[PDB]
Amino acid sequence: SITRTRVSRLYGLPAANPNNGKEYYEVAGRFSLISLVPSNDDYQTPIT
Amino acid sequence: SITRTRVSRLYGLPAANPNNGKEYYEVAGRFSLISLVPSNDDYQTPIT
Incomplete structure (x- = not known):
């Protein structure tokens, strides 16, 4: 509401x-x- | 009155x-x- 008005x-x-x-x-x-990290032969999981 | 005067x-x-x-x-x-204060009660508000 807006006081001192018609609202x-x-x-x-x-x-x-x-x-x-x-x-x-x-x-x-x-x-x-x-x-969907493009990993490889099943070790060395990336990071970043 | 004012004592000591004629008043x-x-x-x-x-x-x-x-x-x-x-x-x-x-x-x-x-x-x-x-x-003649203003009001609507409650018109001019949005339809919903």
């Missing part, structure tokens, strides 16, 4: 102060990823 | 010390007022 009961998040003073927002979880 | 039994508030030591004069009550 109220309007949902969403604007760009004025999205963080509400919070230094950051934090999510937490797990990321699952499979690779 | 006696005069009616009125003299402006020498009107407050007479009081911190403030107070009056209580209610009051109603009409206005």
Whole structure:
């Protein structure tokens, strides 16, 4: 809402102060990823 | 009145010390007022 105006009961998040003073927002979880490392005769697994 | 003068039994508030030591004069009550305040209730908002 925007006080001293005809705007109220309007949902969403604007760009004025999205963080509400919070230094950051934090999510937490797990990321699952499979690779195609071009390896060779079955030893010497690469890295990078 | 003002002792030692001819000014006696005069009616009125003299402006020498009107407050007479009081911190403030107070009056209580209610009051109603009409206005032409703005509102929608609740139109002009997004359709959803």
